[PDB]
Ligand binder design. Sequence first.
Ligand code: RBG
Ligand code: NA
Length: 330
Amino acid sequence: STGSATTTPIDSLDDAYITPVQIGTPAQTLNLDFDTGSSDLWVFSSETTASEVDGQTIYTPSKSTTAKLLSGATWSISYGDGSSSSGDVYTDTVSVGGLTVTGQAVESAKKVSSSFTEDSTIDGLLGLAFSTLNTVSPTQQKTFFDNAKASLDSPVFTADLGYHAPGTYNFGFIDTTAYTGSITYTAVSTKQGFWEWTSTGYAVGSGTFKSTSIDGIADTGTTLLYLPATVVSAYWAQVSGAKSSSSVGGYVFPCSATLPSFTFGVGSARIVIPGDYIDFGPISTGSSSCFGGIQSSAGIGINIFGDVALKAAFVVFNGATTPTLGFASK
Ligand SMILES: CC(C)(C)NC(=O)[C@H]1CCCCN1
Ligand code: NA
């Protein structure tokens, strides 16, 4: 089997991407944020505290003939940005892009933090990191990918995120029309439950490539590129008037600037992030200070290749016995 779904920016900045997901019978379609940095499939629901729902579409298990309470199971998750959610668990039929999993754990939110309530466009998350990070207790649950894997034509999924445009998530096959050149595969460590890999270095604009190992994770659920402070300082030093602002919470730059590209290494290959991808626009409406898309990881404990980086590539998440990541230009 295979599946193929279009993923769409939630706003004009590509803050996140949503992908329609069918849950239940008859189908209830919710727009979920596919997150390769977490392992819970959770949704706004008929159980979510009413004051914490503001425009989201909800899953109502009582309207699904295939929904079953997963008796005694609870979940609670905290993300890198300080947001959180928790609740109870149903199993139900979940389909993505024509690929169906029966008995998928659908984590129904009873409570969500303010940042979820305030985002009317995101109806929940679909985690695609390793199932060792799933938060369901007392019986940990599998991701949608892990449940689909044995049925897929090839044990893979691919992320093809758009810059200010829709893109695609495919399951079970690699669309050889979706990228240019060849795919470079690189090793993955699953020790922290992430798609963790080591980049071979970076360049800023037309500058020399610096060969240096940068461990980090491939995370579709993170908007920006978080790298070591040395690398980030080297990038923003090439932008007149850029500075790190403790008031704003990262590097800002004059909106009048033209940003340089950023290149990262994948083995002997190179992925180039155009400068425009690193513009996240005014810090507040009408400001002439703009927020940068490359930020320091120093206050995180891990480097994160988020959407800024991933959208510059066709990315293969190879879930074979020995997982690997692949990157191609596009
Ligand atoms: C995408 C935004 C708007 C940050 N929503 C959130 O509060 C979620 C997004 C996925 C990672 C954890 N935080
Ligand atoms: Na922000």
